Amino acid sequence: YRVVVLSFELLHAPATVCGPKKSTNLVKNKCVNFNFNGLTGTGVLTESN
Amino acid sequence: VNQNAQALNTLVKQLSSNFGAISSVLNDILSRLDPPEAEVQIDRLITGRL
Amino acid sequence: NCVADYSVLYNSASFSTFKCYGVSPTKLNDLCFTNVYADSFVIRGDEVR
Secondary structure, three states, rough: EEEEEEEEEEOOOOOOOOOOOOOOOOEEEOOEEEEEOOOOEEEEEOOOO | OHHHHHHHHHHHHHHHHHOOOOOHHHHHHHHHOHHHHHHHHHHHHHHHHO | EEEOOOOOHHHHOOOOOOOOOOOOOOOOOOEEEEEEEEEEOOOOOOOOO
């Protein structure tokens, strides 16, 4: 039996391996569902200093 | 004032606890797991937070 | 540093075992890891468990 064990690393680090998704445009200053580097969430976004 | 602020701060800090779940972030559990086990993890988080 | 299309594997039905831990088999196309360690070998069937 040929065996492959795929261990996936979820850390607070850049995603070097991602899924076949489709990056979309940016909507600033408006309540939006967001997905940044796998971090999914819901909120409003502003420019920061 | 300090007692009230300490109570509020402790209540906020309790959201970072795992309470036995795989992750303290509810969105992470929802994104990683299908409902059959995501519900168990969410139940652990619900017990702790309640 | 690559795109990971997992539907090819999970929907191939050419494998006997496809168990996952910490990650559902229908959501790895929606996740994204930093380090994926693909472990490839051969093992007896009664030992696959």
